[model samples]
Target: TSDRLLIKGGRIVNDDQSFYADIYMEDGLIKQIGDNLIVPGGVKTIEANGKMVIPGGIDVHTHYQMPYKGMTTVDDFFQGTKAALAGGTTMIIDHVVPEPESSLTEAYEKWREWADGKSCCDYALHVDITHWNDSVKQEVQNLIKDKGVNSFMVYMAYKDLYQVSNTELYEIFTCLGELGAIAQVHAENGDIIAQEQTRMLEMGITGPEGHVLSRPEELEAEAVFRAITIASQTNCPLYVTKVMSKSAADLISQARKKGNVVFGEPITASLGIDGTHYWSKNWAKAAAFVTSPPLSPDPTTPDYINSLLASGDLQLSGSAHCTFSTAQKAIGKDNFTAIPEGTNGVEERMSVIWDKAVATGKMDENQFVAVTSTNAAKIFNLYPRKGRISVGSDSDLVIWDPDAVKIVSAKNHQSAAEYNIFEGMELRGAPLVVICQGKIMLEDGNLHVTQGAGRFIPCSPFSDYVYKRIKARRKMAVPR
Candidate 1:
C-alpha cells in the first residue's frame, strides 16, 4: 500500500508557469502534475475545483521571539509560524540576534533553544552580524558549515541595536562575498534620523506626526545608495530590507542598471498605507506603525512599486511583521521618539500583496508568485526545493478562492497585536487551504498544524553570480 494525496481539477500557478492540472502527492513530495491525472486507489483526494493552486509562500524576512524595547515580541515561534501558515506562508527565514560580544554560533544556538519545539512550519535563521571581528568570520563559517545558515543581515539603522560602522559593513560584505554567503542590510541612515530628531526636539515639535516628519525620503535614499555602493565594492549580492519610499527604489534601480548584484524589499504596509493615513482619526491609537524611516509617499509611490515589479528590479516583498498592544503603541504619543516600531501583519501579508498587485491588474499572477514566494527563496538560495511546486519538491501549496472577499480587521486577524493598519480594507482574494511539508496546516481559513511540528532548515551558499565576482578579486596581484 502507498500513502498518497491527490488534488483534482485546479488551475496550478507556480511562479515560473501556470496551467490547468491535477496534482498527485506521495511520501511528502509532488509526484506528478498534469491534465486528467488519476488518483491512486486508497489515496486521499481534495476537490480543488474553482480554486487557484499556488506554491506555498516564502517570507524571507520576519522577526519573532526577538527582543525589542525591553520587551520580547508577543508572538513566540509557535504562534508566529501558525499565523504564517494560515496566511499561506510555508517557510520563513527569521533573524537571530547576536549579543554584543557573543559569537555567531552562540547566538544561533540560543535562538535554536528558543525556537526548538515551538514552530509550526519549516524555518531557517539568518545571523545578525553585529560586531565584525576574527570570531565573527569564524562564526559565519561555522554557521554555514555546521548549521547551514549561509545568509546574514547588517542593520544600517537602529543605531542603538545592531548598527555597524562603515568599515565594519565593508568588512562583512567583503567576507560574505569571499565565503559565498548572502548579505542583507536594513538600509536607513540612523545618523540622519538622529540629527533630524534632535532638531525637531529643540523646536518643540513633538507628536505622533513628528515621527514621519523627521525621517524623510532623502534620509532613506541616502542610506540605500550608500549600502548599494558598499555591496558593489565588495562584489556581493545585496538585499535591502523593508524599503518604504520611491526614492529608495529609484536608487536600487540605478544600481541594477550598472550590473550590481542588488535587490530590494518593500513591506505590504508600505505599499498599502501612506503617511497621511498614519494620522487618521480612526487610527489614532495605531502608533505601532512607527518604524524607522516612517512610511511617507505620494500616490506616485505605488506606481514606482509597480514599475519595480514589472521591470524585475524589485525581487521580493516581506511584511516586516511585528505585534504590539494598544498600550505599547501609546508610548510614542507625547514624543514621537518614545513609541516602539512595528505592527501585526502576519495574517494579511499575502492577501494584501496579491489583491494590490494581481487582482488590480498592476502585475500578472506570475509576478505575484515571484515576489511573494519564488524570488525570496532564490535570493536566499533555497531554490528548486523551497520555491517551486513540482515533482520532488516539498508539498507546500496554497489554494486560493479567487472570488472570495473580506475586509481586514483586528477582529478577523490571528496576530497577538491589538491594532491593524489596514483594518476594514476590502480584499478580493483569500487562501482557502495551505499545505506545509506534506501536512495540511490550514483548511478553509482555519489553522490545523500542531505546535512544534515545524523543523529548522539551514540554507545553502550564495549565488554563483555573487561568488564569481569575489573569486576574481582575490586572484588579483597587488601593486607594490
Candidate 2:
C-alpha cells in the first residue's frame, strides 16, 4: 500500500478561520482539500465525524538531553520528540548552547549528530551566542548563509556560563539586524540573581524556597527592558523566551505598542501553575517547580498571562520543556542553586493550555491554534509549509476531541522523566490522532513512530513578518 490518507468531515480550525473539509495527503504532503472530493484507491480514510482538526503544536524552546548543572536532562531527542508527538506537537526548535571557547559550527555539528538519527519528529535549531569576538560576526554570517539557521539566542542568566554582557548583546544584535535574523533572549538579570542567591545562602536559606527568593519578578522585568533597549538600538527583532511574570510581559506589550519588533512567549507551567508550589513542605514537590524566571506567586498571574495571548499582546506559547528525575533534583537538596533547573511540560503543554485558556472561556479555538501553532511558524519562517493546512503544506496535523477528558500523571505520560509538574491536574481537550510527514504516528492511544523518521527543517533568514515590518520602517524613515 502507498502512503496516502483521507481525513473526511472534520472541523478544520486554523489561525485565521475555521470550516469543515476533507483533507487528502500523499507522499508527506497535503495534496487536496475540499467538500467531498473522491480519492484514488489504496487510500486510508479516517471518518472524523466529530473532531477538531488543527495544526500540530510547535515548541520553540526546549532543552532535551542537555547537560546542565552537573546533570543531564532525562529526555533525549528520541524520547523527547516522541513524547511531543503523543502530546500533539510535531516540531521543535531547540537551542544549541556552545561552550564559551568552542566554535558555533562545531557545537552545531555535534548537536546535529545527537539529534539526526534519534529524533522521532521534525526539528530545528537556534544557536546561542555566549560570547563575542572578531570572528563571531563571520561565524554568524556563515551559520545563516551556509547552515540555514536564522535565529540566535542570547542568555541574560547563567552568569558565568551563558550570560552575555550588554555590550556583547548589542554587538550580536547589530550583526543579526544587518543580516536579517531574529534575536531570542532568556531575560533575567544574572548579576542580580547571583547576588540574591548569595544573600539567601548567607541567611542559611538553602532550600527550594530560596530558589524563588533568589530570582524575583523585578529582575526579569529589568533584564527584559534592557534587552529591548539594546535590540531597538541595533534595529534587531527580539523574542523573549520563558516570560514568567506580568512585569516582564508588560514590558514586551508596551514595546510592541511603541512599534518595537518584539515578541513574548509564556510557557505552559507559567500558565497553569503558580509559585506557591515552591513553598510546599515536601522537598521533592517544591524542587520540581524550579526553573529560570521562576513561576510567579500571584494566583491571578496565569489569567493575566492567558489574557495577553488572547488579546494578541503576546505572540505565542512555548514549553521550555526540560526534565529531571526526583533523584536528579535531589542534587540540590542542600543548596537550591545546585539543582538542575527544569520541569516537564512538552507532554502536557497543549492539554494544559486548552483546559486553562480554551475550556475556561478565556480563548476560542482559533486563538488557541494561533498561539500554539500558527504564530510560532510565521515568526520563525516555517509558515505555509508547517503551520497551515493548505494544499502544499506538510502533512502534520492533530485531531482534537473537545469533549474528551484526561487526568495528568507521570505514570501515564510518555517522557522518560519520573515526575510531572501538572501531576493530578485534569484536562479536557484530547488529541484523537496525530499525523506527521504523511504518516499516522499516533491513534487510539497507540504510537507508531520510528527513531530516524525525523528530518531537520531549515529556516531561511529575513523571510518572516518581523523582517518585513523592519524593512518597511527602514524604507519610510527620513534621512538621518
Candidate 3:
C-alpha cells in the first residue's frame, strides 16, 4: 500500500451533501474529510484549488475487445480501460457474450482469461443471456453465488448475437429476479428493423441516409413498452439501455408511476448526435455512427434531450462506446447494413454530456452526479465502493475544472480509434485528476498507472427492495 494521499482545497460532492473539504486516503479507503487536517509524515498531497471533487465515474454499459460483426472490437481491455481512466471513469461493467452451447461460467472464465492482468482500472462483467438451458441456469447460480456478477444483459436486437425467444427471456428474468439481481435489456425490436430495412432496400434506398430510415422511433417505443411489461410480470428489476426515443422515456415513466422497479439510461451519442449528422456530405466517414437503434429521428435538438433529462425519466447515462478504424467504417458505405455498428467516445462521454446538458442549466450538479456515476453503481450493485466519495468508501475521485474548455478531436483523444464522435465540439469541465482505489491514475492530464493494474470486482446482491419484489411475486404464485 502507498502512503496517505491528501487532496486539499476542493469542493467535494457526496450523496448527502456538497461541501468544501480536504479528503485523506489510506489503505485504499477514505480516511478523513475535514479542514486544516495535519498531513502525516511521508504523505503526498495534491492541491485541488478551484476544482470540483466528485466521485470517479462508473460506466455501466460498454463493449471492449468483444467480437462484433466479423472482426474483434478495436479497443481491447487494456486500451479501453486506460481510455476510461482518462475520461475519469474508474470502473466499467462490460458485456461478456457466451458461446453457443457454452455454460455461463465457462464464458465468464474465458473473459477473465482475456481481461486478467490487462485492464487499467476496476471492471465487472454483465452476463449476456444467449443460451438458456439447465447447464446455463446452474452457471447463472454460480455467477451470482461465487463470481459476484449480479447484473445481466438481454438483447432484443442483434439477430445473430443474442436474440432470445420470449419464453427464454421470461425464464432468465424470473431466475435473476429470484436471486435479487438486475436485468438490462437492449430495447429495440429486431423484427421491425429487419422488415423496414428489407422494404427500403427493395425501393433502391441503400445509402447512409437510409440507415436511420430502417430504425424508426416506433420500433424502439414498442420494444421498450414490451420489455417493461415483461419485467413487471416477472417481478424483475429492469434497466433499459441506450434509450433513443421519447416514447421509450414515456413508457419508463409510466412503469415507474405504477410502482415498477425500472430505470432508463441513454448514451452520450444518442443525446449529442442525431440521424441527419450520420448522412452529411462526408457520408463515407459518417458511417461509423450507424450503431444499433440507429440514431433515430433526425434533427433532435439539445433542448429536447434536456427535456427528457428534466422529466426525471432517464436515471443513468452511459457511453456504450465501441471503437473501429476508419478502414472498418468504409465497409458500410456502399450498403448501410454492411457498416460496422459503433462509435468511439469512451474518453469524451462525460465531458460532452456536461457541456451540452448540465452547463446549459438543464440539469444541476446533483443530477449530473446521479446520471454519470451514482446511478450506474446503484444499478450494477457497486454503490459505495465505486460511485460516491465518502468516508469508508474506496477512494475513487475526479477533480473537475468546470471553467476549462477544449475542442474535441481525435488528435487529442486517448481512445485507440481513428475518429472521434464529438469532433470539433467544444467541451468544458475537464477532469484535472482522476484517482482510483486510493491511487492517482491520472494527474494534470497525464496517466501514471500501468496497464493490468485494474482488478475485477465481484458484485454483491442488490437492494432490499428488489428482494421484496421477488418475494411478493413468489407469494402470488404467478407464472413467470
Candidate 4:
C-alpha cells in the first residue's frame, strides 16, 4: 500500500557526513542511495538539485497541550504536531507529568490517549517519576519493558510541585541505569527558588520580570553540579534540559572530563528570546516569554549561548514547545509565578537555529545536523533508524533550500500560536518539503494532510558511541 519516490541529486546530509546522491524510498523506509536511482514509470519524482536533504528533526523535549499551573497550553496534539511536521521535525519526546495525586501510569495513559489519533507526527513519552516507591520502581521498569518508554525525567526545582530529593534522584538513576535506558533531568535548585520566590513576594516584586531575578545563576549551577554528581555515581546517562547558565555548562564540561555521561540541550526559543522582555509593560508580550528555567532575555545573552553550542559545550538544540497564549498567561498577571510557563516553538525551532547559529557562522551544515538531529538520536537510543541517511533507515527527511528566505510571522506559522517569539527574524534556510515515514507531509509551506499518522517510536538500548565521545572529551586538555 506504499508508493515509491525518488529524490535525485541533492546533498544528503548526516551528522558527520554529507554527499550528493539520488535516494529511493518505499514502505516508509529509505530504500537506496547512489549516483542515480533507476526511476521506474509512475514513481513520484522530486528534483533535489541545489537542496540539502537531511534527516527530519527530533525534538527531544516538548510539552504539547499540557495543562500546567492551572491552565492548559494553547497547542494540542493536532496543532502542535502539525507545526512539528511543517517545521520538518518528524518526531518528539514529550514529558508526561503525572499528577501529584495520581499514578505515573495513569497520567501516561491519559497523555497517550490525547495523542493517539490527533498527532500529525510520531511521538514518544517520557514518564516523570516525581513520586518514588518500590511500587513506582516496578512501574518504571514496566514503562520500559511493556510501555516501551525508554526515557524518564525528574526535576531539581519547582520544589513545591515537581522537585525530587537527592535521595530520590539517586534511586531514580539506579533503576534506569540498571535497565540501560536514558534519564532526562531538569536541574534548578528547588529550595533556593522556593526561598527566592517567597522573598520576592514579600517585597511585592510580582511582575513577570521578577521570575528571572528570583532564579539566580548560583542556584542553577549548584543544582546542575548536584545532579551530575548523582548521575555519575548512579551511571545514569543524563541530558540536562531547560536551563541556560554558564556555570552549569562549565560544570557539565568538567563532569564530562571525569567521564560522566552528561549532555546539554538548550531550547532554540531560549537562544533567540532575551529574558528582559518578561518585564514588558505590554504584559501580554511579557507573559508569552515566561517559561521555566527562564530565558535570560538580555540582548547579549544569546551570543554566549550561541558560542556554547558552537564550541560543543551544548550537545543538542530542542524546542521544549510548551506554549501558553497571552490570555492564559494573563491569569498570572499580578503574580509572576502564576504566569503559565512556556514559549511558542514547535514550528520555528529549526529556523531560529539556522538564523541565529548557521547564518552567523556559529555552525556549519554538519554540526547543525548533529545538534538538531543526530546527537539526540544517539543519546535517546533512536539512532541508525531515525537520525541518519542509511539505506535501511527511515525516510523521515527534510529537503531544505539554503537559498530560500522566510520572514517569520505567526500568520505564516503552522502552530496554533498567534504570537511568535522569533517574529521578524530572517531565516536564510528553510524546509521547502518535509517527508515523514516516506509520506510527503509538507510541501512548499503547505500541509498535505492532517490527523494522526504518527506512531510511537520505542527506544532501544543505548549505543557505545555516547561513552566513546565522553572519553575523547575527557582526554582533551581542560581549558583554564
Best by lDDT: 2
TM-score of every prediction relative to native: 0.94, 0.97, 0.94, 0.94
**C-alpha-based local distance difference test score of model 1:** 0.79
**Model 3 spans > 4 angstroms off:** 465-480
Deviation of model 1 at 121, angstroms: 0.6
What TM-score, to 2 decimals, does candidate 4 have?
Answer: 0.94
Query: Compared to the true structure, candidate 3 yields what TM-score?
Result: 0.94
Residue 194 of candidate 1: its Cα lDDT? 82
> Using TM-score as the measure, what is the rank order of every candidate, best first?
2, 3, 4, 1
Angstrom error at residue 300, model 1: 3.1
lDDT of 3 by residue, 161-242 (tens): 5677788788988888888788889888887788888887898877776778888888888888888888888888888888
Clash pairs for candidate 1? none
What local distance difference test score does each model get? Answer: 0.79, 0.89, 0.80, 0.81
Tens-digit lDDT string for candidate 4 (102-174): 6888888888898877887778888887777888888888777888687788888887777889899998887
Top TM-score prediction, candidate number: 2
> Runs in model 4 with CA error above 4 Å?
467-480
> What does candidate 2's lDDT look like per residue over 110-169, in tens digits?
778888888888899999887778887789899999997999988998888878898898
lDDT of 3 at 319: 79
Instruction: Give me the displacement of residue 185 in model 2, in angstroms.
Output: 0.6
Q: Write the per-residue lDDT of candidate 1 for residues 41-128, one digit (tens) a residue.
A: 7777889985789888888777887786678777788888887887888987788888777777888988887777788888888898
